[PDB]
Design a protein around this ligand. Structure first.
Ligand SMILES: NC(=O)C1=CN([C@@H]2O[C@H](COP(=O)(O)OP(=O)(O)OC[C@H]3O[C@@H](n4cnc5c(N)ncnc54)[C@H](OP(=O)(O)O)[C@@H]3O)[C@@H](O)[C@H]2O)C=CC1
Ligand SMILES: CN(c1ccc(OC(F)(F)F)cc1)c1ccc2nc(N)nc(N)c2n1
Length: 186
């Protein structure tokens, strides 16, 4: 394993989802950023693993599942096999992270990316160890029914810079947004 990361886009009121989709209209360059960050692996011959909950998997349009060029793992205690198109299934986050140590993954996985939803983020964010959060701040309030867990700034430090992460305010479809990276080591 090459490390543990969360990536999310969040409104000003901490919203991430509404009725099975994002709260805001599609931001193409935000999606392009998500796909680049999650897919890009520096270790030759390895790929990244994306871990997501069951509702997040079904929120991706079927033509775009699995997320291409990544190993897709879904968390569910109800499902008996990965949902159709997905690669692995785990009943907990610890199980998923143990799975990466097993022979079928131990030499394949470079970065692990938690791509949502809320319960997955909350647990990962309180997981010991070095962890980065890649947060897109959507700089407006949007009505939401799913929210990002609190970021404890006593442990997570906002970085001044990060390679491959544009620093400046961005705007698509009249909506301003900014890419941030946070890091903890505990
Ligand atoms: N803005 C963004 O960056 C993102 C937005 N989204 C949006 O967020 C919403 C989906 O989020 P949310 O409702 O939080 O759903 P999740 O994706 O977290 O799905 C929840 C289901 O996942 C399973 N689950 C979650 N955590 C675990 C776990 N730790 N161990 C075992 N199973 C687990 C359970 O399945 P079971 O009941 O089968 O046990 C649970 O019912 C959607 O609206 C989606 O569009 C999603 C990701 C990112
Ligand atoms: C929910 N999800 C998602 C939804 C739909 C998709 O279909 C596709 F790929 F566009 F075809 C792909 C990814 C997203 C979408 C944008 C996201 N942004 C950031 N910064 N962080 C996340 N975790 C996130 N996750």
């Amino acid at each position: 394993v090459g490390s543990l990361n969360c990536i999310v886009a969040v409104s000003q009121n901490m919203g991430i989802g509404k009725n099975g989709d994002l709260p805001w209209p599609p931001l193409r360059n935000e999606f392009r950023y998500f796909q680049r960050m999650t897919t890009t692996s520096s270790v030759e011959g390895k790929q990244n693993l994306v871990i997501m909950g069951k509702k997040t998997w079904f929120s991706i349009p079927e033509k775009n599942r699995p997320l291409k060029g990544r190993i897709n793992l879904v968390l569910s205690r109800e499902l008996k096999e990965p949902p159709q198109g997905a690669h692995f299934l785990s009943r907990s986050l610890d199980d998923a992270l143990k799975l990466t140590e097993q022979p079928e993954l131990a030499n394949k996985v470079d970065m692990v990316w938690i791509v949502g939803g809320s319960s997955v983020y909350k647990e990962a964010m309180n997981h010991p160890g070095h962890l980065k959060l890649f947060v897109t701040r959507i700089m407006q309030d949007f009505e939401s029914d799913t929210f990002f867990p609190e970021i404890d700034l006593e442990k997570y430090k906002l970085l001044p810079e990060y390679p491959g992460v544009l620093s400046d305010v961005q705007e698509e479809k009249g909506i301003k947004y900014k890419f941030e990276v946070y890091e903890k080591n505990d």
